[PDB]
Amino acid sequence: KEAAFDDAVEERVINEEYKIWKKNTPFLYDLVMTHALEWPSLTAQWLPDVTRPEGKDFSIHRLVLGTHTSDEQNHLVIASVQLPNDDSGKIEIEIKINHEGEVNRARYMPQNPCIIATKTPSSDVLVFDYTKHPSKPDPSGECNPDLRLRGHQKEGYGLSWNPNLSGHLLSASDDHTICLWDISAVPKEGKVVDAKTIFTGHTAVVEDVSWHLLHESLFGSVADDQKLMIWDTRSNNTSKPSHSVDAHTAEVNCLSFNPYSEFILATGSADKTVALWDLRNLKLKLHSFESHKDEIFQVQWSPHNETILASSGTDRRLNVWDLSKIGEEQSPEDAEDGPPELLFIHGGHTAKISDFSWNPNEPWVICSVSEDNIMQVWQMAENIYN
């Protein structure tokens, strides 16, 4: 074909980009650590479980990976990374856990930061507890669901715990469905368990969902209806949300909220853009960003900075924005590079970027993962914010 030949020369182009990227890495970053995983993750999430032994350079943080795989046993993972502090290291896996299916998403409960959860290509979601599983699997051993959930009909990519409450948990799918569970209720035998409540607002695949970080009853929801619904629970109308907005032109994937604010809400999308509304007026798209080249899958505000934000997707680039810098009348060269609110671009990944995450407990560090089994963690240079 034409296509099959364009998309070989492309791969050659990719490598050429990559090597020049590498030769400039001292001059863009303060740290990078590329690790080639043995199977691709589709998921990341740091933990707050920091530690720093004494007379040292570094601390140790933790990851929560997954695994997409061809045939073998999927098993989710929890790494330990190792980075210097003030004035080198390596990262390794330390605890693996078998998994019926593959791992689409996985987010830890912030109340107890060991009770992680997980989606699967099966309709069900799971819950684990890496206390009560061994540090490695073995066939003689046996992995219980360690609590199992149920309520969908198909799979998806949306999870969320609610940091205001404990145990409350939200999900999503292509099932046109947003299910809600509580687990503080039955820590009995009760392995399987069904909805506190479902919701059916959307009329397309619903891609993401998340709780608002200050109210206890308040979560967004984002679909390929082009839409954005905002549900308040404790209303009991499970197809009529409080607020709604036809947001973007194309599909909508990501939904996000700003921690240091109370009414702001970023949002990603497959019209190569990012939008940030405000709850007090959902009709008014405050701003938009226009420097991606393909659909977007993840947007994450950063903590330690109210005002900044980060985005990724198919186009192999993870961008970081900034809202202070908006409207800044700029030299022609600046426009020659990119708009001003755009702050940094990370061109390290030679494939789609499946997920990424900021960490708490360091200022500006991101882990970012791919589909070529690569995992970078990187701290952008210091001379860009000061």
Partner: protein, 64 residues
């Protein structure tokens, strides 16, 4: 001691030459103008129609 093998395959190179020539004919980014044709940005979204590959996917068929 050791060179290594260049990945750029001299079967790509023709399809760098050809579209380059299609371009210097059409949109004349070398002769009629400077090496920078316009400032090149202001269009934003249909700049990918010259060439075939200002940006293509790794993959057009995808799991998610």
């Amino acid at each position: 001691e050791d060179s290594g093998k260049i990945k750029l395959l001299l079967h790509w190179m023709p399809e760098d030459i050809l579209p380059d020539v299609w371009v210097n004919e059409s949109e004349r980014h070398q002769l009629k103008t400077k090496v920078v044709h316009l400032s090149k940005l202001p269009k934003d979204t249909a700049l990918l129609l010259d060439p075939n590959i200002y940006r293509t996917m790794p993959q057009k068929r995808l799991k998610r």
